[PDB]
Amino acid sequence: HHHHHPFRATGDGLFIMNEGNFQYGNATLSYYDPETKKVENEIFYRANAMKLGDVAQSMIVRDTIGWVVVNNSHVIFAISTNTFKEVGRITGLTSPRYIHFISDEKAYITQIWDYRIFIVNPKTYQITGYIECPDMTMETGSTEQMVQYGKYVYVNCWSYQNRILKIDTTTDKVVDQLTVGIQPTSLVMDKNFKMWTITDGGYKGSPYGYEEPSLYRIDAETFKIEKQFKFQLGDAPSEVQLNGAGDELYWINKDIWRMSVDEERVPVRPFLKYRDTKYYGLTVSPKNGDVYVADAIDYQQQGMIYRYTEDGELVDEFYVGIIPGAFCWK
Ligand code: CNC
């Protein structure tokens, strides 16, 4: 007829969630093919004729449907992973963080500025319940990333909290907790069924705290801490990630750092050196073993991704949205 055929996502590509400026409404989604090395920006806007919203935080792909969590627009959009077109949405979310699917019929949505985890039925798009976290307020509340062991979801508590919680999905109740250093940022489960989390500093002039941050290996069966790796005061680490095998752990602390999940010690040498910039998100390809590093670079201008081989040679670098912070494989 007339207009050029719409953009489609063929193949085993990569969504990049760009946070945008908080309060400025300029969050965007990007898509990248590793084979083609072509990035498409603003795919949500261009597909739906509608701005993504305000702090685009995270994403999960589930049977060709992508669940994109817009933290500060109080929403999660279901999109086609082929078309990027909205197929449905979940609204009325305090300030969502991450979504974890127990089943098709039930998922948990963590929140900041709330003491509850929301329970939804993804097939109806409806809230089904709430999970009251102990010793938590609406004023300082924070749930974040999740992993499942058996019948249990574990979840780290970040902004002005110092805990990992343990939830029985049979009852949807918190049944156990573990205190760690302040503001654990992230959580992953390795091939040995050990969780890893890394704290940030707090910040200079926090009313909650400012201490030395730490990486923790934790057994999933027994919920006990096995190691701790303490770093410098004024470090502010973030975004722990695993490779596809779950035997190589990576995190951000000025540089990108890498450690085999086996072995008792933090390597001397990073995976990738500091650049007087703000490395901010991170992922590993489950096909290639390749490492993508999201640079926010000053948090103002258009950000960049940097792609490296498992063995540390630069493959590609490409411009995305403002403050890229998270990835999701298709
Ligand atoms: C830098 C930064 C960022 N932060 Co802070 C983080 N960590 N933050 C910080 C640091 C600021 C040090 C500094 N001034 O450089 C740091 C660690 C101290 C901080 C503090 C906080 N932050 C916090 C959070 C949760 C967030 N932060 C982001 C704004 C989050 C950003 C991510 C994002 N997508 O925006 C972020 C990575 C980039 C913001 C920025 O510097 N923009 C550059 C430039 C454009 O500045 P801007 O327009 O004026 O932005 C200002 C604000 O963002 C302010 N600010 C920073 N964080 C917050 C948080 C809140 C709640 C408010 C009202 C303002 C801020 O600092 C900037 C001053 O110019 C956030 C979007 C990150 C995320 N995606 O989860 C998220 C807020 C989302 C929400 N719904 O609340 C803390 C609650 C974390 C904590 N418990 O320690 C805390 C709040 C303290 C406060 N209100 O003063």
Numbering used by the authors: 26 to 355
What's written in the study?
Contrasting with Enterobacteria, members of the dominant genus Bacteroides often encode several BtuB vitamin B12 outer membrane transporters together with a conserved array of surface-exposed B12-binding lipoproteins. Here we show that the BtuB transporters from Bacteroides thetaiotaomicron form stable, pedal bin-like complexes with surface-exposed BtuG lipoprotein lids, which bind B12 with high affinities. Closing of the BtuG lid following B12 capture causes destabilisation of the bound B12 by a conserved BtuB extracellular loop, causing translocation of the vitamin to BtuB and subsequent transport. We propose that TonB-dependent, lipoprotein-assisted small molecule uptake is a general feature of Bacteroides spp. that is important for the success of this genus in colonising the human gut.
To compare CNCbl binding to BtuB3G3 and BtuG3 alone, we also determined the crystal structure of BtuB3-CNCbl to a resolution of 2.6 Å. A superposition of BtuG3-CNCbl onto BtuB3G3-CNCbl (state 1) has a Cα RMSD of ~0.6 Å, demonstrating that CNCbl binding to BtuG3 and BtuB3G3 is virtually identical. Moreover, BtuG2 and BtuG3 share 80% sequence identity, and a superposition of both structures bound to CNCbl shows that residues binding the ligand are the same and the overall structure is identical (Cα RMSD ~ 0.4 Å). Thus, we conclude that CNCbl binding by BtuG2 and BtuG3 is the same.
